[PDB]
Design a protein around this nucleic acid. Structure first.
Lengths: 57, 116, 121, 113, 154
RNA sequence: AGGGUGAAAAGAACCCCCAUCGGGGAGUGAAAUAGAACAUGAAACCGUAAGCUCUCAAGCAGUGGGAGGGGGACCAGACC
RNA sequence: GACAACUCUCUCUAAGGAACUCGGCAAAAUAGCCCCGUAACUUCGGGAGAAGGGGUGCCCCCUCACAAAGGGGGUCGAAGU
RNA sequence: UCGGAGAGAGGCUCGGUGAAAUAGACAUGUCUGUGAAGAUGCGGACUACCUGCACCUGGACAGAAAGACCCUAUGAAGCU
RNA sequence: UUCACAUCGACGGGAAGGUUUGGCACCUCGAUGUCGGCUCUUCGCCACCUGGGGCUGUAGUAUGUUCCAAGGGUUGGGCUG
RNA sequence: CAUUGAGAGGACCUUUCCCUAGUACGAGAGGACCGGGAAGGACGCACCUCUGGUGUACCAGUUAUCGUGCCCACGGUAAACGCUGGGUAGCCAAGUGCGGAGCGGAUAACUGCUGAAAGCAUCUAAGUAGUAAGCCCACCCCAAGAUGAGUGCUCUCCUA
RNA sequence: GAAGGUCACGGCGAGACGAGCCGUUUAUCAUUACGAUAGGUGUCAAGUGGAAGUGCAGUGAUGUAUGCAGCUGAGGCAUCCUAACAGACCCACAGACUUGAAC
């Protein structure tokens, strides 16, 4: 609508860059799900009979 | 939030909901696993289990109205003689959901629906 | 709900037939007028040979309303078409007889009107 | 207040101890019932004919929109469990149409219809 | 007094039992204390019956409730009006210093907040099993806490 | 609108990561902290690292007086 | 996905009803065919598609069809262009 | 007249791509008074943790427009 | 009636406040959009109503004037922009 | 976690009728002050179990047309659910319920007592007592981010 | 590296985004510590409504008996069969000077 007069640019703009803090893996722990050797960070398929797999044994 | 809200109306008109749902339904009892958003998963969840309980009762009363949902005359007979009879001992829990890795290029949600 | 300028089919022989509300009497500012409240209205259509000619500023009382009236007895009372009866500054109607039944909510204000009335609801 | 989620429905379960005569009496039936008429009261009761448009609720059940033909167009429903109420008696055999809505018999007011 | 809570329980062992949801304190009125039994009932055995009792519940929430809802008195069209009616009615000046007159009616938000109804007589009262009947009103929707204080008519 | 890497291009085989775009090495050259956006390549603008100041303090905020702190001093001498 | 204020395009809305407003703007409503009927005025060509009303659904019968329509009878829903 | 509710396209959040009017410089609170005399930046005083989001939107005589109003300059362009 | 000041008050005078009618035209024609209505208010006072008081050619019920006080409240329409 | 609490805001408007005395008062007519009770308007908030509204995600009737092979039974589409009707939950209202208070501290205008200077007299100049919806307080919301960062209860850690 | 907080998951008569409230498959430890927050299911209530099929009467339409049957969204009770995963991280180790009252 209106128009800003003096544009400080420096300072002000920089401060408004804290709210965008580095969102490191936005999720819970979901660490090693046992016998995974690694597995993705966020929760994933559990361990049991071949499930979710396109092919079977 | 709507005091006592249930079943998302998505971002499309009502008639647009009872149309897309008809897809994820048959495709679920015809293949097995269907990928979709977390919202759709929760939505289709009931629309599927409520269609299974109908077959459990058999008769024709649960077939005329049922046809009103799905159109495929192939997946209909299924429920009336296939997997529902397998849950004849299990009260509920006909469907099962699970979250997975985010979309490809898109944020979220993502989940795979499959019969227990 | 008898707001300003409204049609109230008279329930007597005062001469009028259907007057139009003009102002609800009560306090500083009256929004609506339920059954049992006086209202100053003017007649639009009236019978020739009558003591009250057309176009006149005369007070009257509401005997029937199209709104759902409620009471302490948890009872609800309502009618089809709202009506009214011409009333003199003294408190008594200019007419003699009354039609369109009557509302008990008036017996608390005007007893004569309810007395002469044929049936009370 | 006994622990058994029946209290909130106890006040109603203890008041519903008054069995209703007509199972549904969904027709013309012109029952008079009773009307609390105080003022100079002589311990007397009066009644008015009724009609269709039978309604109700899981709680304080409501009779039905009287829409009686007496006088002009008497209407307004009421309650039975009310402190002042008398036994209900049948009138004419039940007909066939719909019990919940009926705008007819009002604008079509006549000897027939 | 197990799930969720943990620290409030152990910090209550001080001569007492069964912890509620939120402990509330009162004022002076001559009553029993922790030395005889430490357990208040719902009879009050003093406030006297028949009198009216106040009820302080928790108000509901309409989200970012507008201004036409916190006052309900603003005309406006919609089928042709540019105000769309729902609009706050356009408040403010155009060429005046002042200071936007803070505190004036505006949209804002809504949520849980104390209410209190005061007065209100009673029809029935029962003890032991715990149960009371208030003359309608009853702030907030069934699921709050309420203080059901006596009566500060003074 | 848009100029010139170097004297001659020997203007980059092969090797490693990636989708056999891109980069880093191995080499060539006195130089590629010169290589096809390439010479010398400042300023406006946009960042990292380090020392100091920075939540009870406000007004084109620099200046004069001026403690403390991180370093550099002189075999005190009180300074940058 | 969420789905509050507010804005845009709309539905349904108790009583009363334009009392809003510069102005009933914007809406709502009227709006099918046949038949009956239709004022002042008129260079009497018109207004008269004024206004104001009724029926027309479906099936059967009269022809176990003369492409329609009409005339009787019966019947369904609150409503039958 | 007191409007409310609901269904859609935006608004809000996240993912990808990705503008502008404008702007001397900023650590650009209120108020009284004062001031080429209706400034936050003067003086006194009061108040006030630092920093965002959404929304409502009065101040910065905000933005766009060296105004089409008046007058001035023995200007100009048409017409009578 | 009488009686100057319950009320009012001629010939004249001294001030406050400042929204009227003007002057000034001091700051703005590299511009700050005029009036009214609608929406939403803020403050002050010599506040009309409610409350507390004096005088009264104030019997009472109702009024006139004056003092303190605004805490609050302070209308719907016909016609016209 | 529970409170006290420096402060701020909101609420704070008002009528009629009746009892009281239709006495006192007044030739009549007409008709109180003080105090008390009941019943409303406007407005604010909440509740919305009742009366009603929305409900194109509940159900039903049904027009034109297409399709499920067909009859039947259904489904899709039709200016903005095709039109139309009812309705549970929730959300609101013409719905329901309640507070706008009284009682105090201290005062303005005014009415006061006693008694000075002006041995009378006079409200004081010295000492006191009354006094409105203003002010303070009383009711309500926030409130030690009032960094003069409070108070009270309880819990965890004593490897080199 | 505890109390505790936070994140996530399943949800909320609480929300624009955050916050806030309840819960996380022994429905966290003892003593019953009262610990299904949601979806589905079962029952019931409520709202429509007395349909499908079949039999019968009539040329047909239509109607009747079973049918006050069936269907059934957020309401209530009940039921955790599905998903609420065993775990992590963050936050630390009785914790300053002077004086007074106590020891």
């Amino acid at each position: 609508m209106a128009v800003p007069k003096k544009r400080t640019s420096i300072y002000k703009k920089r401060i408004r860059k804290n709210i965008w803090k580095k969102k490191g893996y936005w999720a819970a722990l979901k660490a090693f799900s046992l016998a995974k050797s690694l597995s993705t960070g966020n929760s994933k398929s559990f361990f049991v009979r071949k499930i979710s797999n396109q092919t079977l044994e | 939030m709507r005091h006592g809200r249930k079943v998302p109306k998505l971002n499309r008109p009502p008639d647009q909901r009872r149309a897309l749902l008809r897809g994820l339904t048959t495709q679920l009892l015809k293949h097995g696993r269907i990928k979709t958003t977390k919202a759709r998963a929760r939505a289709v969840r009931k629309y599927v289990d409520k269609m299974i309980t109908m077959a459990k009762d058999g008769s024709l009363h649960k077939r005329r109205q049922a046809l009103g949902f799905i159109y495929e005359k192939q997946i209909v007979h299924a429920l009336f003689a296939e997997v529902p009879d397998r849950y004849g001992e299990r009260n509920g829990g006909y469907t099962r959901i699970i979250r997975t890795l985010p979309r490809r290029g898109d944020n979220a949600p993502m989940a795979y629906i499959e019969l227990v | 709900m008898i707001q300003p300028q409204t049609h109230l089919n008279v329930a007597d022989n005062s001469g009028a037939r259907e007057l139009m509300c003009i102002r609800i009497i009560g306090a500083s500012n009256r929004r609506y007028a339920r059954i049992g409240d006086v209202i100053v209205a003017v007649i639009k259509e009236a019978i020739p040979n009558t003591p009250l000619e057309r176009s006149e500023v005369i007070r009257a009382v509401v005997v029937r309303t199209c709104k759902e009236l409620k009471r302490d007895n948890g009872m609800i009372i309502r009618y089809d078409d709202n009506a009214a009866v011409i009333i003199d500054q003294e408190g008594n109607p200019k007419g003699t007889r009354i039609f369109g039944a009557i509302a008990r909510e008036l017996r608390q204000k005007f007893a004569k009107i309810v007395s002469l009335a044929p049936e009370v609801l | 207040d006994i622990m058994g989620i029946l209290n909130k429905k106890a006040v109603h379960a203890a008041e519903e101890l008054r069995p209703v005569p007509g199972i549904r009496t969904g027709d013309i039936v012109q029952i008079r019932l009773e009307v609390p008429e105080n003022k100079r009261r002589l311990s007397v009761y009066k009644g008015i004919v009724i009609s269709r448009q039978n309604a109700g609720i899981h709680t304080t059940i409501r009779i039905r929109r009287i829409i009686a033909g007496v006088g002009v167009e008497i209407v307004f429903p009421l309650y039975s469990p009310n402190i002042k109420e008398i036994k209900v008696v049948s009138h004419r055999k039940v007909r066939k149409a719909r019990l919940y809505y009926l705008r007819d018999k009002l604008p079509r007011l006549s000897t027939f219809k | 007094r197990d799930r969720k809570l943990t620290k409030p329980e152990m910090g209550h062992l001080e001569k007492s039992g069964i912890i509620p949801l939120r402990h509330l304190q009162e004022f002076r009125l001559q009553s029993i204390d922790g030395f005889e039994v430490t357990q208040k009932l719902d009879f009050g055995e003093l406030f006297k019956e028949g009198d009216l009792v106040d009820v302080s519940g928790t108000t509901i929430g309409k989200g970012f409730q507008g201004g036409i809802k916190r006052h309900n008195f603003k005309r406006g069209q919609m089928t042709h009006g540019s105000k769309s009616h729902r609009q706050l009615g356009s408040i403010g000046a155009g060429t005046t210093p002042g200071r936007v007159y803070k505190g004036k009616k505006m949209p804002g938000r809504m949520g849980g907040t104390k209410r209190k109804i005061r007065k209100l007589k009673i029809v029935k009262i029962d003890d032991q099993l715990n149960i009371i009947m208030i003359k309608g009103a009853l702030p907030g929707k069934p699921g709050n806490l309420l203080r059901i204080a006596p009566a500060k008519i003074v």
